[PDB]
Amino acid sequence: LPRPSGTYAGLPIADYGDAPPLSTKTMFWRTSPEKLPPGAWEPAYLGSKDERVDGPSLQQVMRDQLKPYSEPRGLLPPQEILDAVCDAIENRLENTLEPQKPWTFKKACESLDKNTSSGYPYHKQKSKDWTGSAFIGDLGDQATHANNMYEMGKSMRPIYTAALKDELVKPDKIYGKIKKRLLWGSDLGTMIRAARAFGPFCDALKETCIFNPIRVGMSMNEDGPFIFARHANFRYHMDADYTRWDSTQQRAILKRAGDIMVRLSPEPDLARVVMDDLLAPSLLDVGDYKIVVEEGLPSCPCTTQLNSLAHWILTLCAMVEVTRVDPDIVMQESEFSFYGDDEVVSTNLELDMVKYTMALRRYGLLPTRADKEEPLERRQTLQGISFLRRAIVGDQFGWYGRLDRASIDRQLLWTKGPNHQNPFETLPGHRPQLMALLGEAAMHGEKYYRTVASRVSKEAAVVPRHRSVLRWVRFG
Numbered sequence: 001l002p003r004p005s006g007t008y009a010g011l012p013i014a015d016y017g018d019a020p021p022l023s024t025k026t027m028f029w030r031t032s033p034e035k036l037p038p039g040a041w042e043p044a045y046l047g048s049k050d051e052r053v054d055g056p057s058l059q060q061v062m063r064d065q066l067k068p069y070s071e072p073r074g075l076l077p078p079q080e081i082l083d084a085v086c087d088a089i090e091n092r093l094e095n096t097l098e099p100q101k102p103w104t105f106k107k108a109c110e111s112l113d114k115n116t117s118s119g120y121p122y123h124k125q126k127s128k129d130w131t132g133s134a135f136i137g138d139l140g141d142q143a144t145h146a147n148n149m150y151e152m153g154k155s156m157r158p159i160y161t162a163a164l165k166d167e168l169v170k171p172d173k174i175y176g177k178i179k180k181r182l183l184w185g186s187d188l189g190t191m192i193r194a195a196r197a198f199g200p201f202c203d204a205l206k207e208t209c210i211f212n213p214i215r216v217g218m219s220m221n222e223d224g225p226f227i228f229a230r231h232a233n234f235r236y237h238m239d240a241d242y243t244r245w246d247s248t249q250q251r252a253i254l255k256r257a258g259d260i261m262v263r264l265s266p267e268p269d270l271a272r273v274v275m276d277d278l279l280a281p282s283l284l285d286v287g288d289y290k291i292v293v294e295e296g297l298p299s300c301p302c303t304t305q306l307n308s309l310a311h312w313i314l315t316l317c318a319m320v321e322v323t324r325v326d327p328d329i330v331m332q333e334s335e336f337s338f339y340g341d342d343e344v345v346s347t348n349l350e351l352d353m354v355k356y357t358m359a360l361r362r363y364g365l366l367p368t369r370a371d372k373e374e375p376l377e378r379r380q381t382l383q384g385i386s387f388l389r390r391a392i393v394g395d396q397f398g399w400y401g402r403l404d405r406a407s408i409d410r411q412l413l414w415t416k417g418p419n420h421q422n423p424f425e426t427l428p429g430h431r432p433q434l435m436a437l438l439g440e441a442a443m444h445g446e447k448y449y450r451t452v453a454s455r456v457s458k459e460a461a462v463v464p465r466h467r468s469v470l471r472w473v474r475f476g
């Protein structure tokens, strides 16, 4: 048996696949047998077995998601600009991050999310081999071998397992042009080496998730108010609202981001080896085949910081391009918030929104206007902009993130459970997450709260006073 070859969804085949088949099930269940309102969200499409519509096979849905990964890259920002931006960011993290002690193997092992899959090659939930303290059996071995390579600075090829995201989507993605977000399931060896190598940096960054613009690890409730307060110190506010962020990414940019992480790691030599592995053409298991994807971001959990960091680089570049001001001064005159593709940009500087949107499109990115029409707008009020699925709001007590009425109503119609074929089935039994749901409704005032409390009480089949619950969720 020789390696197969050819093309799969515009990408070169490199080998046979070891991946288990795509899930034809959803974790979502209705909360009442009643018919869903018009245009109400539902779990994403479940394949040929999906009772709701006749659409294509999941592999064909997946193949669609890979298409933009073969698309030509956009253009690199001007070298003169890349370098100054890069240097400014590196300097900024230098000045703000606390040096770390290396992450142990024990550490890296404890940090892994134990509920998700281990990926290539054992494809078993990480818990099946965990003992509260360490990995045993297969996963034990995979982890030990990977750890040995890391300490020796030896290269390992990450293998990724494609899957599609089980989530609530707007109806048009089920009944209209069918879509379902692609995920890259990293392998455990990689998860271990990445953990050891970059965990330290991820910690340092997280400790300063308020002074520095990478918001990963923040608490919306505890850190929202301070974070948005910093943003409101600046005249202009905007959100670029990217489409297909990960797929439109440049390895060239990711490598610059990766550098910064390598340079700012307690073991830069060992880190270097891991980063290069992470960024070399990616091997992606799509089921029958392992394909090679040269470009874009692998949608491995540690990459959120790398993603946020590229994001940082990209946005600073585009501004430096337009305003012709030093990245250092741009950062003096702005406040940023990045979480992967999600962003808020706040600045005093008069930004030529035309030249700015131009620049972003040229880097390969797909920013979209709030309205969706044919150049990005900017406001003098921070009220309206959103971050981490919440709407930024401001009152006499300060700023907070409020979950929108729709997301609340949507969380009432659906609950999570065991996997099943028919999302319209209701679940016998049932749920506290109903706790926090009453807290989100409080921040829309009383006359919206009573009606949410009405639906919450009637899920018995004390509901605290509005006064009481508004203060708890606002002020603690």
Ligand SMILES: O=C(Nc1cccc(C(=O)Nc2ccc(S(=O)(=O)O)c3cc(S(=O)(=O)O)cc(S(=O)(=O)O)c23)c1)Nc1cccc(C(=O)Nc2ccc(S(=O)(=O)O)c3cc(S(=O)(=O)O)cc(S(=O)(=O)O)c23)c1
Binding pocket: 044, 064, 065, 066, 067, 068, 167, 168, 169, 170, 173, 179, 180, 181, 182, 244, 247, 389, 407
């Ligand atoms: O999957 C994608 N995009 C995607 C990515 C990759 C490829 C494709 C694709 O289809 N490519 C192609 C296919 C076929 C062909 S074809 O065969 O040729 O015809 C293509 C031909 C050509 S070409 O022209 O011929 O070259 C080119 C391409 S290309 O690749 O597109 O270039 C093709 C599409 N999006 C996606 C999917 C699923 C869920 C969600 C999702 O995010 N749900 C949500 C979750 C959470 C929140 S929340 O947390 O904020 O509440 C959400 C809030 C809101 S909000 O409240 O309204 O703001 C809304 C949603 S939403 O998504 O429900 O909208 C939310 C998003």
